[PDB]
Amino acid sequence: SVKSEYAEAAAVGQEAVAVFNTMKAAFQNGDKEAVAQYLARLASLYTRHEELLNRILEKARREGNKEAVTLMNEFTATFQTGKSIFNAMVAAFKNGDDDSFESYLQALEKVTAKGETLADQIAKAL
Ligand SMILES: Nc1cc(F)ccc1C(=O)O
């Protein structure tokens, strides 16, 4: 159902939290080869998460679930802000710019946490 797709989406978000925290530790420790790999893994997780979110939103639209559509539109907009910051972080890593990388890491943490405050409402509305 749209709910089992939402639980999978939630699990993928949690996988990203796990891999992100491991990546942050590796960045702090100077292990650039590990960071590179975690960044690739986070990019794949973003693509998969986005695909699950799009299927949930499309199914809520086809079901006429107006409140779920509203909440999913808001959440996906914030999700995309996160993804844009993530892309800038990857670019800073490629460019050898640790100052910007650290800043984007902190910013991405705050933007993703902001979007997660909509999760309980979405789960209830689906
Ligand atoms: N795939 C991700 C990567 C990040 F760095 C942060 C968040 C996500 C996510 O899918 O929520």
PDB file of all heavy atoms in Angstrom, residues 45-58:
ATOM      1  N   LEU A  45      21.435   6.497  -2.326  1.00  0.00           N
ATOM      2  CA  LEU A  45      20.311   6.533  -1.394  1.00  0.00           C
ATOM      3  C   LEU A  45      19.372   7.705  -1.703  1.00  0.00           C
ATOM      4  O   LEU A  45      18.141   7.569  -1.652  1.00  0.00           O
ATOM      5  CB  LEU A  45      20.830   6.589   0.037  1.00  0.00           C
ATOM      6  CG  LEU A  45      21.345   5.242   0.549  1.00  0.00           C
ATOM      7  CD1 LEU A  45      22.223   5.410   1.756  1.00  0.00           C
ATOM      8  CD2 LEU A  45      20.149   4.356   0.881  1.00  0.00           C
ATOM      9  N   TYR A  46      19.929   8.862  -2.054  1.00  0.00           N
ATOM     10  CA  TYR A  46      19.078   9.979  -2.436  1.00  0.00           C
ATOM     11  C   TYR A  46      18.219   9.635  -3.637  1.00  0.00           C
ATOM     12  O   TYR A  46      17.034   9.975  -3.670  1.00  0.00           O
ATOM     13  CB  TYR A  46      19.922  11.212  -2.762  1.00  0.00           C
ATOM     14  CG  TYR A  46      19.881  12.335  -1.768  1.00  0.00           C
ATOM     15  CD1 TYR A  46      21.054  12.911  -1.303  1.00  0.00           C
ATOM     16  CD2 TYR A  46      18.663  12.834  -1.292  1.00  0.00           C
ATOM     17  CE1 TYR A  46      21.008  13.942  -0.402  1.00  0.00           C
ATOM     18  CE2 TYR A  46      18.610  13.859  -0.379  1.00  0.00           C
ATOM     19  CZ  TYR A  46      19.783  14.412   0.062  1.00  0.00           C
ATOM     20  OH  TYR A  46      19.758  15.437   0.972  1.00  0.00           O
ATOM     21  N   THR A  47      18.818   9.016  -4.656  1.00  0.00           N
ATOM     22  CA  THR A  47      18.063   8.686  -5.857  1.00  0.00           C
ATOM     23  C   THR A  47      16.928   7.734  -5.523  1.00  0.00           C
ATOM     24  O   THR A  47      15.781   7.917  -5.981  1.00  0.00           O
ATOM     25  CB  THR A  47      19.009   8.079  -6.896  1.00  0.00           C
ATOM     26  OG1 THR A  47      19.915   9.080  -7.341  1.00  0.00           O
ATOM     27  CG2 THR A  47      18.229   7.504  -8.072  1.00  0.00           C
ATOM     28  N   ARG A  48      17.217   6.711  -4.716  1.00  0.00           N
ATOM     29  CA  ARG A  48      16.198   5.738  -4.333  1.00  0.00           C
ATOM     30  C   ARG A  48      15.130   6.367  -3.458  1.00  0.00           C
ATOM     31  O   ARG A  48      13.935   6.080  -3.612  1.00  0.00           O
ATOM     32  CB  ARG A  48      16.866   4.574  -3.612  1.00  0.00           C
ATOM     33  CG  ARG A  48      15.923   3.536  -3.091  1.00  0.00           C
ATOM     34  CD  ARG A  48      15.066   2.911  -4.157  1.00  0.00           C
ATOM     35  NE  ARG A  48      14.205   1.895  -3.568  1.00  0.00           N
ATOM     36  CZ  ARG A  48      13.119   1.415  -4.160  1.00  0.00           C
ATOM     37  NH1 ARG A  48      12.733   1.857  -5.346  1.00  0.00           N
ATOM     38  NH2 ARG A  48      12.402   0.480  -3.544  1.00  0.00           N
ATOM     39  N   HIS A  49      15.522   7.240  -2.542  1.00  0.00           N
ATOM     40  CA  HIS A  49      14.558   7.876  -1.652  1.00  0.00           C
ATOM     41  C   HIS A  49      13.610   8.749  -2.458  1.00  0.00           C
ATOM     42  O   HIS A  49      12.385   8.668  -2.306  1.00  0.00           O
ATOM     43  CB  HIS A  49      15.330   8.694  -0.609  1.00  0.00           C
ATOM     44  CG  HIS A  49      14.539   9.090   0.601  1.00  0.00           C
ATOM     45  ND1 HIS A  49      15.095   9.818   1.630  1.00  0.00           N
ATOM     46  CD2 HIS A  49      13.246   8.885   0.946  1.00  0.00           C
ATOM     47  CE1 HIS A  49      14.192  10.014   2.572  1.00  0.00           C
ATOM     48  NE2 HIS A  49      13.047   9.497   2.161  1.00  0.00           N
ATOM     49  N   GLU A  50      14.183   9.560  -3.354  1.00  0.00           N
ATOM     50  CA  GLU A  50      13.397  10.410  -4.245  1.00  0.00           C
ATOM     51  C   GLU A  50      12.407   9.584  -5.049  1.00  0.00           C
ATOM     52  O   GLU A  50      11.240   9.987  -5.225  1.00  0.00           O
ATOM     53  CB  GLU A  50      14.342  11.204  -5.175  1.00  0.00           C
ATOM     54  CG  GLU A  50      13.558  12.302  -5.960  1.00  0.00           C
ATOM     55  CD  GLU A  50      14.413  13.238  -6.820  1.00  0.00           C
ATOM     56  OE1 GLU A  50      15.628  13.399  -6.581  1.00  0.00           O
ATOM     57  OE2 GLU A  50      13.831  13.874  -7.725  1.00  0.00           O
ATOM     58  N   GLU A  51      12.824   8.409  -5.530  1.00  0.00           N
ATOM     59  CA  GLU A  51      11.900   7.621  -6.344  1.00  0.00           C
ATOM     60  C   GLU A  51      10.735   7.117  -5.500  1.00  0.00           C
ATOM     61  O   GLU A  51       9.581   7.176  -5.937  1.00  0.00           O
ATOM     62  CB  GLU A  51      12.640   6.464  -7.015  1.00  0.00           C
ATOM     63  CG  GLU A  51      12.173   6.205  -8.453  1.00  0.00           C
ATOM     64  CD  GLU A  51      11.419   4.886  -8.616  1.00  0.00           C
ATOM     65  OE1 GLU A  51      11.946   3.853  -8.138  1.00  0.00           O
ATOM     66  OE2 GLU A  51      10.314   4.881  -9.222  1.00  0.00           O
ATOM     67  N   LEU A  52      10.994   6.686  -4.260  1.00  0.00           N
ATOM     68  CA  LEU A  52       9.913   6.263  -3.365  1.00  0.00           C
ATOM     69  C   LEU A  52       8.991   7.425  -3.016  1.00  0.00           C
ATOM     70  O   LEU A  52       7.764   7.258  -2.952  1.00  0.00           O
ATOM     71  CB  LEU A  52      10.466   5.664  -2.079  1.00  0.00           C
ATOM     72  CG  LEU A  52      11.270   4.401  -2.302  1.00  0.00           C
ATOM     73  CD1 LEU A  52      11.913   3.974  -1.006  1.00  0.00           C
ATOM     74  CD2 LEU A  52      10.378   3.299  -2.869  1.00  0.00           C
ATOM     75  N   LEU A  53       9.562   8.592  -2.736  1.00  0.00           N
ATOM     76  CA  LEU A  53       8.744   9.768  -2.438  1.00  0.00           C
ATOM     77  C   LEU A  53       7.864  10.137  -3.608  1.00  0.00           C
ATOM     78  O   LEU A  53       6.701  10.515  -3.413  1.00  0.00           O
ATOM     79  CB  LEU A  53       9.625  10.963  -2.062  1.00  0.00           C
ATOM     80  CG  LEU A  53      10.343  10.836  -0.723  1.00  0.00           C
ATOM     81  CD1 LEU A  53      11.285  12.031  -0.603  1.00  0.00           C
ATOM     82  CD2 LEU A  53       9.349  10.791   0.421  1.00  0.00           C
ATOM     83  N   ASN A  54       8.391  10.052  -4.833  1.00  0.00           N
ATOM     84  CA  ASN A  54       7.556  10.402  -5.987  1.00  0.00           C
ATOM     85  C   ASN A  54       6.406   9.422  -6.147  1.00  0.00           C
ATOM     86  O   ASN A  54       5.287   9.825  -6.498  1.00  0.00           O
ATOM     87  CB  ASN A  54       8.397  10.454  -7.257  1.00  0.00           C
ATOM     88  CG  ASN A  54       9.268  11.688  -7.334  1.00  0.00           C
ATOM     89  OD1 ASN A  54       8.936  12.736  -6.771  1.00  0.00           O
ATOM     90  ND2 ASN A  54      10.391  11.573  -8.044  1.00  0.00           N
ATOM     91  N   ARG A  55       6.640   8.129  -5.899  1.00  0.00           N
ATOM     92  CA  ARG A  55       5.541   7.161  -6.032  1.00  0.00           C
ATOM     93  C   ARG A  55       4.472   7.377  -4.960  1.00  0.00           C
ATOM     94  O   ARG A  55       3.268   7.233  -5.220  1.00  0.00           O
ATOM     95  CB  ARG A  55       6.079   5.731  -5.965  1.00  0.00           C
ATOM     96  CG  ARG A  55       6.819   5.302  -7.237  1.00  0.00           C
ATOM     97  CD  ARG A  55       7.923   4.297  -6.977  1.00  0.00           C
ATOM     98  NE  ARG A  55       7.518   3.155  -6.165  1.00  0.00           N
ATOM     99  CZ  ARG A  55       8.291   2.101  -5.930  1.00  0.00           C
ATOM    100  NH1 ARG A  55       9.496   1.985  -6.478  1.00  0.00           N
ATOM    101  NH2 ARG A  55       7.847   1.137  -5.125  1.00  0.00           N
ATOM    102  N   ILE A  56       4.877   7.742  -3.755  1.00  0.00           N
ATOM    103  CA  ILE A  56       3.921   8.010  -2.688  1.00  0.00           C
ATOM    104  C   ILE A  56       3.065   9.220  -3.044  1.00  0.00           C
ATOM    105  O   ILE A  56       1.838   9.192  -2.905  1.00  0.00           O
ATOM    106  CB  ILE A  56       4.651   8.224  -1.348  1.00  0.00           C
ATOM    107  CG1 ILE A  56       5.307   6.912  -0.895  1.00  0.00           C
ATOM    108  CG2 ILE A  56       3.746   8.812  -0.320  1.00  0.00           C
ATOM    109  CD1 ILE A  56       6.268   7.128   0.204  1.00  0.00           C
ATOM    110  N   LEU A  57       3.712  10.315  -3.473  1.00  0.00           N
ATOM    111  CA  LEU A  57       2.985  11.525  -3.847  1.00  0.00           C
ATOM    112  C   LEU A  57       2.050  11.254  -5.013  1.00  0.00           C
ATOM    113  O   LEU A  57       0.900  11.690  -5.000  1.00  0.00           O
ATOM    114  CB  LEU A  57       3.986  12.651  -4.172  1.00  0.00           C
ATOM    115  CG  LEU A  57       3.447  13.940  -4.813  1.00  0.00           C
ATOM    116  CD1 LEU A  57       2.450  14.628  -3.881  1.00  0.00           C
ATOM    117  CD2 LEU A  57       4.550  14.898  -5.187  1.00  0.00           C
ATOM    118  N   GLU A  58       2.518  10.531  -6.031  1.00  0.00           N
ATOM    119  CA  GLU A  58       1.635  10.260  -7.164  1.00  0.00           C
ATOM    120  C   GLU A  58       0.441   9.412  -6.731  1.00  0.00           C
ATOM    121  O   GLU A  58      -0.698   9.641  -7.186  1.00  0.00           O
ATOM    122  CB  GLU A  58       2.439   9.607  -8.285  1.00  0.00           C
ATOM    123  CG  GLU A  58       3.355  10.589  -9.040  1.00  0.00           C
ATOM    124  CD  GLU A  58       4.779  10.053  -9.316  1.00  0.00           C
ATOM    125  OE1 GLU A  58       4.976   8.816  -9.439  1.00  0.00           O
ATOM    126  OE2 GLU A  58       5.714  10.880  -9.414  1.00  0.00           O
TER     127      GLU A  58
END
